[PDB]
Amino acid sequence: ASIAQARKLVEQLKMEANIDRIKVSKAAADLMAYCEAHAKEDPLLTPVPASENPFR
Amino acid sequence: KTFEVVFIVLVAGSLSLVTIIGNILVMVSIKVNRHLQTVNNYFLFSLACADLIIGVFSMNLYTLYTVIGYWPLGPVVCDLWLALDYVVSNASVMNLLIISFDRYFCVTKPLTYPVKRTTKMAGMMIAAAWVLSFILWAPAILFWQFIVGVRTVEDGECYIQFFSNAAVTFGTAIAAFYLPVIIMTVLYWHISRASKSRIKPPPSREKKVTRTILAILLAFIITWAPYNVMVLINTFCAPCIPNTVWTIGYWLCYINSTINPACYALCNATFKKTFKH
Amino acid sequence: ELDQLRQEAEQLKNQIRDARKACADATLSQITNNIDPVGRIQMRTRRTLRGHLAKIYAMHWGTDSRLLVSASQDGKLIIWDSYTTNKVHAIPLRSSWVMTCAYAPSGNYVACGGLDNICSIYNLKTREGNVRVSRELAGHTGYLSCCRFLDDNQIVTSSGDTTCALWDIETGQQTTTFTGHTGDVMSLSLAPDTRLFVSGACDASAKLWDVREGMCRQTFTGHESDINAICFFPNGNAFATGSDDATCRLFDLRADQELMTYSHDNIICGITSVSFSKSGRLLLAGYDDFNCNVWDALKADRAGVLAGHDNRVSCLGVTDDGMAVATGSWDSFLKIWN
Amino acid sequence: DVQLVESGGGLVQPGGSRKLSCSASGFAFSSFGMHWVRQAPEKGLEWVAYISSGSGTIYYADTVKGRFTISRDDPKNTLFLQMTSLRSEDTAMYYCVRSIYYYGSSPFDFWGQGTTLTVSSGGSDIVMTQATSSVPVTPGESVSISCRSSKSLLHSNGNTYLYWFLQRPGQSPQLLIYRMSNLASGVPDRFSGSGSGTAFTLTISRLEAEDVGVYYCMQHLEYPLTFGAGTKLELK
Amino acid sequence: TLSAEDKAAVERSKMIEKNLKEDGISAAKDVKLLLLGAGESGKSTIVKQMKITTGIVETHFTFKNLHFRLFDVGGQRSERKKWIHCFEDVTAIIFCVALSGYDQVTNRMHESLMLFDSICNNKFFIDTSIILFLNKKDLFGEKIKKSPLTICFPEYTGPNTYEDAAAYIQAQFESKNRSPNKEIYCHMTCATDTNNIQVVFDAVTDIIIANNLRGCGLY
Ligand SMILES: CC(=O)OCC[N+](C)(C)C
């Protein structure tokens, strides 16, 4: 009955509650470093001259 | 003299302002609103452009002419202005005719016609109307005197020269007025007849349709009728027509251009909802 | 014994919340108070692809960033050429109700699905000319929402029966099934390494699956309504979920918690599609109020609007080299922007 | 599976006429472009005509315009060539090729088998020259074949329209590399092509006894299509 | 032109665009419907009397050089609001109500009324007209002769005859719309009735004519 469902739910929660967590400061610094380390290769926020733009 | 001229100038300016404001309102409303923009509105756009041109140029220059009393700029400008006026008037009439045809084909052939009428067909029909009006009016008006090899326009007036000729003015007037009015009234009778209820206090759907049809047809006929009837009595016997009635007539034809934004572009509730702004 | 297990689950979730609270020391807004704003990113329409007759529901780019696929309820799956606005294939479908499409990374196959509960696979490089149906997968008990190609041999689908599955196209059998959701599943995005993926459901939750063991790994719950679009960050350590409560949020895998929400009091209509840029500095999100938005993903402030559609935008996607972005709305048109 | 078989050749007196047929079976005939290519008893290959899918555009060679007519009947998936006022220089073997065209397709991928035809006695083209004529080879050795043109084949689109064909003796030509370095379907990885503008080469690695024959180069930049004299490979 | 053929590709594009146009033209002579209702409301009966497995089940039929597509979507047992946006732009909606709603499942008639209210005021169906079928009209006579109608509607005040009660039910159902751009057609249908395709036909024609009049601006 509901015993199997409850056992599955608690097993899932226990399995999920054993994961390493890093600090949010690092998890934001990594994102910002990736964003600023690829600024020159993103042709969207840095407009491309019409000499190399393939759609115009 | 003292007050009559200023009164008629004020009336002409008021009508010209109304015409321009209505046309520009139509033009802006078509562009700005996504809902209002549709493939069945390019005809209204073309009609608005024609009405605007007629209003500004024809109304203002003819007002100046009728007040001062004689054509200032000489025969060349007179011929150019007459050609432009007649061409754009015929373009307006042809736009009305194309709208009538579109409504007839959309109502009588409901399912297949809307998809078979691509956006290119609309532009083709507008181009056909404008080009046909241009070919019919501009060449003859500009080159009648060179062809017949004599010029009779007096230096004290500005009117089309081949009005003396019988067959040509009959052909132009008969076509330009009497053909589109007959086509329009026949098509609108067919639309009204085929718009009843077939099943088994709001007003019945046929009542609104008939009201709009009568409004459109009366608005066209009452304005454009006085001018063309005097042409046919003029071509045989000129002295019958007094001078004052001709101006009133030439002007009513202009007044017909004021109410086109009302008759054609104020039936959809979206126009009025936008117009509150 | 139901009450005891319920209490155990309550204790487990309390521990989860306490750990999440402990692991947070600052906010991404605080650390990003010094970076340079991107300014007004003005984009212009370059091409308009007008072939369809009904509302467009899905669209996927090609691996070479030139070929494009689109699907609609006119019964057609026509693939385009972006540079020349040419039509190169037109594939008639069996069911007009189509809500997803995919285009294989190698370029040989495409996929389709919808209310018919069947994911179809087509071969484009056949020896005899015209395209033909290769497989017709049928294992789901509800409408499909999103399908992605692992490779030419295996595909992953998400359906509205609260399950996701991984198929073997050669045999045609449902190799693995993923379960754990409560409501309909409506979105799916694969990792850059294609070793794991996420899925957002209509119970306001998103899960982190693993394609090998077939077991959910993390559960993220921040939204207040159904989630309609997910997309990974380019580095594969974060994703953005656009939900139906007129907001979108960014989640981080390792931190296991929300990072930043992108909302504005002038916005009330919900999201339909979400995609990033090649560097992750921009977030593009479709909307129900007939236009699209661009968000400075590191500052949560608007940085442009992509107007030009007069109905709901339903699909959105940037190319694999980041040169262009394509959108498609319910007015049967599709645009390209640079 | 895919088959192109022709019929209608034989002995013709000068001044007569003949009708050649190309019956196809195994593919979507109605959505393909079909060519006609003839080969002299000892010379190389020469292009004859072309008809597009839907019979929209038809092209003819310079030496057959006004005498030959090419038409197709795709409901019965057969291709025709009507010939009028034959001369002594029209005696050759006529082939039938399919040339599906779209973005990324491989034209000239399948060739017919050919019908003989013998007749008894009664400027702006892009010339392409293959200086090499015949070279000896041995198995296990690498050789290079060169084909040069007179106009640059590098279009502004970035494409370079050069096609390489192989004709083993007593057989019909095959497509090796198309436009100008892509590898065709079913051809091994040994073959490779390179070049730029007007000088091109074909690289063969680990030559065996099965890839012996004559190699031809063709251009597709602008009609008429021009072939080359071809280079013959024979065992040393 | 500067095209390097590179020009049969354009020809192919034009040919398949022509095919798309031809397919679109030929797919505009079939009317798309949508059948809604509840169990035991007789919505299967109207399908059965109309002449000629998960997913969308259809009832593909034709009548008088106009082609019809009846989509029955009662088999999709999932969230309704997540796939009804693709079912808009249908010509009409067919709603079936059983007149013998005199028992619990609340009274079935009240559930039907609530569902009709929900479907005629949805944001995707504000402008789509509804054709309403009142099924099982033969049972209703004996049911109302045996039992009164006040069990369903306490505020009923009038004769207990067939005509007045039927008119009251029809008015109660027709008083659920507020949009002036749509109309509700009604019909009393027995369990076994002669014609029910003509009623769909002459209503769909009226819907199409009204839509054309509105679009032209002549309305
Ligand atoms: C075309 C036509 O005959 O009408 C005359 C127009 N009008 C009176 C403004 C000059």
Author numbering:
A (entry chain D): 7 to 62
B (entry chain A): 19 to 218, 377 to 453
C (entry chain C): 3 to 340
D (entry chain E): 1 to 122, 135 to 248
E (entry chain B): 4 to 55, 182 to 234, 241 to 354
From the paper:
The M2 muscarinic receptor (M2R) is a prototypical G-protein-coupled receptor (GPCR) that serves as a model system for understanding GPCR regulation by both orthosteric and allosteric ligands. GPCRs modulate cellular functions via coupling to heterotrimeric G-proteins or β-arrestins in a ligand-specific manner. In this work, we report the cryo-EM structures of the M2R-GoA signaling complex bound to ACh in the presence and absence of LY2119620. Here, we investigate the mechanisms governing M2R signaling versatility using cryo-electron microscopy (cryo-EM) and NMR spectroscopy, focusing on the physiological agonist acetylcholine and a supra-physiological agonist iperoxo, as well as a positive allosteric modulator LY2119620. These studies reveal that acetylcholine stabilizes a more heterogeneous M2R-G-protein complex than iperoxo, where two conformers with distinctive G-protein orientations were determined.
Unexpectedly, we observed two major conformers with distinct G-protein coupling orientations from the three-dimensional classifications of well-defined complexes, and reconstructed the cryo-EM maps of the two states (denoted as S1 and S2) with overall resolution at 3.21 Å and 3.32 Å respectively. The overall structures of ACh-bound M2R in both S1 and S2 states are highly similar to the previous crystal structure of the Ixo-bound active M2R, with root mean square deviations (r.m.s.d) of 0.818 Å and 0.982 Å, respectively. The rotamers of conserved motifs or residues, including the P5.50-V3.40-F6.44 core triad, Y5.58, Y7.53 (NPxxY motif) and R3.50 (DRY motif), are almost identical with those of the Ixo-bound active structure, suggesting that both ACh-bound S1 and S2 represent fully active M2R. Y1043.33, Y4036.51, and Y4267.39 constitute an aromatic tyrosine lid on the top of ACh and form cation-π interactions with the amine moiety. The residue D1033.32, which is highly conserved among the aminergic GPCRs, engages in an electrostatic interaction with the trimethyl ammonium ion of ACh. The Ixo-bound orthosteric conformation is more similar to the ACh-bound S1 state than the S2. The ammonium moieties of Ixo and ACh-S1 essentially overlap and form similar interactions with the tyrosine lid and D1033.32. As the LY2119620-induced differences at the G-protein coupling interface for both states are negligible, we used the structures without LY2119620 for the following comparison between S1 and S2 states. The hydrophobic contacts are much stronger in the S1 state than those in the S2 state, mainly mediated by the conserved ICL2 residue L12934.51. Interestingly, we found that this extended TM5 helix overlaps the position of the α5 helix of Gαo in the ACh-bound S1 state, while this direct steric clash is not obvious for the α5 helix in ACh-bound S2 state or Ixo-bound state.
